Curated annotation (Swiss-Prot), chain A:
The PIM (PUB-interaction motif) motif mediates interaction with the PUB domain of RNF31. GO terms for cellular component: ATPase complex; azurophil granule lumen; ciliary basal body; cytoplasm; cytoplasmic stress granule; cytosol; Derlin-1 retrotranslocation complex; endoplasmic reticulum. ATP 1 binds at residues 227-233, 328, 364. Signal peptide: none annotated. The keyword Cytoplasm applies. NCBIfam families: CDC48. Residues 688-707 are annotated as: Disordered. The gene is VCP. The modification N6-succinyllysine is found at residue 648. This is Transitional endoplasmic reticulum ATPase. Changing residue 504 to A: Impairs catalytic activity of RNF19A toward SOD1 mutant. Does not inhibit interaction with RHBDD1.
């Protein structure tokens, strides 16, 4: 498009990049060997381009390939202007240190072998620590320098005596890992990261713009959840592109045999570094700093808090020392920094999403090519609950399971493993799916325990109700287009007036297993404690967990036990329980109307539950349920029998006909009684056979294995005769009146 | 003005006993926030038809009814305490006040009759996605 806007293409010459200046480029600034025409690189980077080109036959355009950028370690977005470097000078003394990777491997004297390939045709620019690959030998000649005074490195001359230092340097080995400042773990918070970068670098790089606008640098923020789940990862990525280092927030500094002066020393060191270069504050979570003297004051604690507030307020306004603040739990945040003047501006904490999930999955795949059939988009959409490094942990678990299977089926490998097997250790989409199904959210792991999973199909009846629930679960979540077209938010749903004893808990568990999403279910003993305000804390924790793991339905038990009004049980615990219930309702009526905040309620009969907050202004929306049926009873009985060893002679039709007025628990009980009778018969037959074998050792192997592999119709009839129904007409009337109370 | 938007069974079916408790609470709120228009809407819901004339429950219900009558017969006479109740029937909520017994002037604020349901549904459909032929 333009002579300056170069295109990217593979060069037709031997080099993979066409490093050849155009007529204007080679006329305005010609690159020469004697005059180092260093490009406008990042962080004072100097590079030289030597690519063969035939300009006499045809005119070629400048091409910037990826190989040149990788070799020079120059990031995109910076204009590379080749101009003579006047800041490059010779050093007073060059103390070349022996590189351990280069010293170990060279036959004979290390100096002679190193100087043999370093005397001429070095094919590397004059810069210390420059990543230059040497063609031939399969060993890059890393010119490690102990200390270079002039520019990045001194001129390569033999006029300086090389002295071997008493101690080595591991910067070359550490930079390989330290360079891993990937934005892939910052997927979703790109806007916040860009704002932070602008407020940090550009504001420090262009203080005149800040002076003209009149706004100084802000205090900053961090990410909640684990470090590396958004906090340590962000900190390390920022530090990788940081001028002066920050100081980690370890409270143990002043906490010593000294007088606590370590805080003052830290402030002084921060001032010295900020004067030296643009430094930051490696602020830990808000809890690490102070609760704002909420729990206790603490003599040294209050002194340190005051000193920190003084340093933050009377900061080096002239030096514009960018003290990076954080964002942990707001309760952990002290008010002084939360107030303007101590901390300039504190921002929120980032959160994960499906796009960030895809980014983290891309990072993990870049770490190692696990599978060739894994649908990263499908997993990320499925992985709604996983946040932060949880996705990476799940990927590692999938790799571990797949590798365990492959090795155990391959070889114990107590000494060594097959290199063919090692190269053939790729993970599978099936392995990833199996681990993910085994996997669960990190917060839920600290939150809830497992339960017996069942299939929504495995439970029969309420097909319309099941369809409505599934639609509410998916079309409001799995379809954002449905939300856009409708606009109506999902209904809360108050309490399914379901079967009294068969358990709406069964339906809830089957749905949650079928739902494959965050699900909240607790009992009434959850919050009541001999700790003042403990119930309110429990409610707040539940709400915060739901907000973190939305969408989730609160299948809270003790619905009647919480729905009862303030009066009646005079005087309960002086109303403190009523106060907690009211707060929770206000915390939930009353909850955050976003991210599909859902709840699930049910009772044997609604009459026990008082509609104090169950009104559809405090319960938002409502959803009731019916009692059992007869055809649905036959269906549920058929499902239960299908789950078990069925029989043909049993009159299931007449059983269903008699089963018009029963409950599903009653059918399960009849099945259990028949199974018990069958097991008793089998045990009796086995006892008779053993007695015969003992009395006559000839009848041991002359008996059928299953005397009744199917259910004896006689056994079923006897169980029915011994059985009774749990249907109560007065209870039916009460439940109907509660329904009639609508 | 910050009208005291009262609930339904929150003044008559008072949770602290008879209606007098919630009446006094509303009186204190209106005196501390005058003019707090005590919008005690849904008088039919406000009464909530407690009932239960058995043992002490009947005493509690009678006390609640008498306290409601007393509140309707003298309360915080400031802050414009207007109770726009729901009249399901002539005796559904406080028949004596429905008759010219408790309220000398039962001032019902009449509203112009509109197809406000139609307009609200139109606004909702505009907020959603329904168009073209709409009878």
């Amino acid at each position: 498009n333009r002579p300056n806007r170069l295109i990217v293409d593979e060069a037709i010459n031997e080099d993979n990049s066409v490093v050849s200046l155009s007529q204007p480029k080679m006329d305005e600034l010609q690159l020469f060997r004697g005059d180092t025409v260093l490009l406008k690189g990042k962080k004072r980077r100097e590079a030289v381009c030597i690519v063969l080109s035939d300009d006499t036959c045809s005119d070629e355009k400048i091409r910037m390939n990826r190989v040149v950028r990788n070799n020079l370690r120059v990031r995109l977005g910076d204009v590379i202007s080749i101009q003579p470097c006047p800041d490059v000078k010779y050093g007073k003394r060059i103390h070349v240190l022996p590189i351990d990777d280069t010293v170990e491997g060279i036959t004979g004297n290390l100096f002679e072998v190193y100087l043999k390939p370093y005397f001429l045709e070095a094919y590397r620019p004059i810069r210390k620590g420059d990543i230059f690959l040497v063609r031939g030998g399969m060993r890059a000649v890393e010119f490690k320098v102990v200390e270079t005074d002039p520019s990045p490195y001194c001129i390569v001359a033999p006029d300086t005596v090389i002295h071997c230092e008493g101690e080595p340097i591991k910067r070359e080995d550490e930079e390989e890992s330290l360079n891993e400042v990937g934005y892939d773990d910052i997927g979703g918070c790109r806007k916040q990261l860009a704002q932070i970068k602008e407020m940090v670098e550009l504001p420090l790089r262009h203080p005149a713009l800040f002076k003209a606008i009149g706004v100084k640098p802000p205090r900053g923020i961090l990410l909640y959840g684990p470090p590396g789940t958004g906090k340590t990862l962000i900190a390390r990525a920022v530090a990788n592109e940081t001028g002066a280092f920050f100081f980690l927030i370890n409270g143990p500094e002043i906490m010593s045999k000294l007088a606590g002066e370590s805080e003052s020393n830290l402030r002084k060191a921060f001032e010295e570094a900020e004067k030296n270069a643009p430094a930051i504050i490696f602020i830990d979570e808000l809890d690490a700093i102070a609760p704002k003297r909420e729990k206790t004051h603490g003599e040294v604690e209050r002194r340190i808090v005051s000193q920190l507030l003084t340093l933050m307020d009377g900061l080096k306004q002239r030096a514009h020392v960018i003290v990076m603040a954080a964002t942990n739990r707001p309760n952990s945040i002290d008010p002084a920094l939360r107030r303007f003047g101590r901390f300039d501006r504190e921002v929120d904490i980032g959160i994960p999403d499906a796009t960030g999930r895809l980014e983290i999955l891309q990072i993990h795949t870049k770490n190692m090519k696990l599978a060739d059939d894994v649908d990263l988009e499908q997993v990320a959409n499925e992985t709604h609950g996983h946040v932060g490094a949880d996705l990476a942990a799940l990927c590692s678990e999938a790799a571990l399971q797949a590798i365990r299977k492959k090795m155990d089926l391959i070889d114990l490998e107590d000494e060594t493993i097959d290199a063919e097997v090692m190269n053939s250790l790729a993970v599978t989409m099936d392995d990833f799916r199996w681990a993910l199904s085994q996997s669960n959210p990190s917060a839920l792991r600290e939150t809830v325990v497992e339960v017996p999973q069942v299939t929504w199909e495995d439970i029969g009846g309420l097909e319309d109700v099941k369809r409505e629930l599934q639609e509410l679960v998916q079309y409001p979540v799995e379809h954002p287009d449905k939300f856009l077209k409708f606009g109506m938010t999902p209904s809360k749903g108050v309490l399914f007036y379901g079967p009294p004893g068969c358990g709406k808990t069964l339906l809830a568990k089957a749905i949650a297993n079928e739902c494959q999403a965050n699900f909240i279910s607790i009992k009434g003993p959850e919050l009541l404690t001999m700790w003042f305000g403990e119930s309110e804390a429990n409610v707040r924790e539940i709400f915060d967990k739901a907000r973190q793991a939305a969408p989730c339905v609160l299948f809270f038990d003790e619905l009647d036990s919480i729905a009862k009004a303030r009066g009646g049980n005079i005087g309960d615990g002086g109303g403190a329980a009523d106060r907690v219930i009211n707060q929770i309702l206000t915390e939930m009526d009353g909850m955050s109307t976003k991210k599909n905040v859902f709840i699930i309620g049910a009772t044997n009969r609604p009459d026990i539950i008082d509609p104090a907050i169950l009104r559809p202004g405090r319960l938002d929306q409502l959803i009731y349920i019916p009692l059992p049926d007869e055809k649905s009873r036959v269906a549920i009985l058929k499902a239960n029998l299908r789950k078990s060893p069925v029989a043909k002679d049993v009159d299931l039709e007449f059983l269903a006909k008699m089963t018009n007025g029963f409950s599903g628990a009653d059918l399960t009980e009849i099945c259990q009684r028949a199974c018990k009778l069958a097991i008793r018969e089998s045990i009796e037959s086995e006892i008779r056979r053993e007695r015969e074998r003992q009395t006559n050792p000839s009848a041991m192997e002359v008996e059928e294995d299953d005397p009744v592999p199917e259910i004896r119709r006689d056994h079923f009839e006897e169980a029915m005769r011994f059985a009774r129904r749990s249907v109560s007409d007065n209870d039916i009337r009460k439940y109907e009146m509660f329904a009639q109370t609508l």
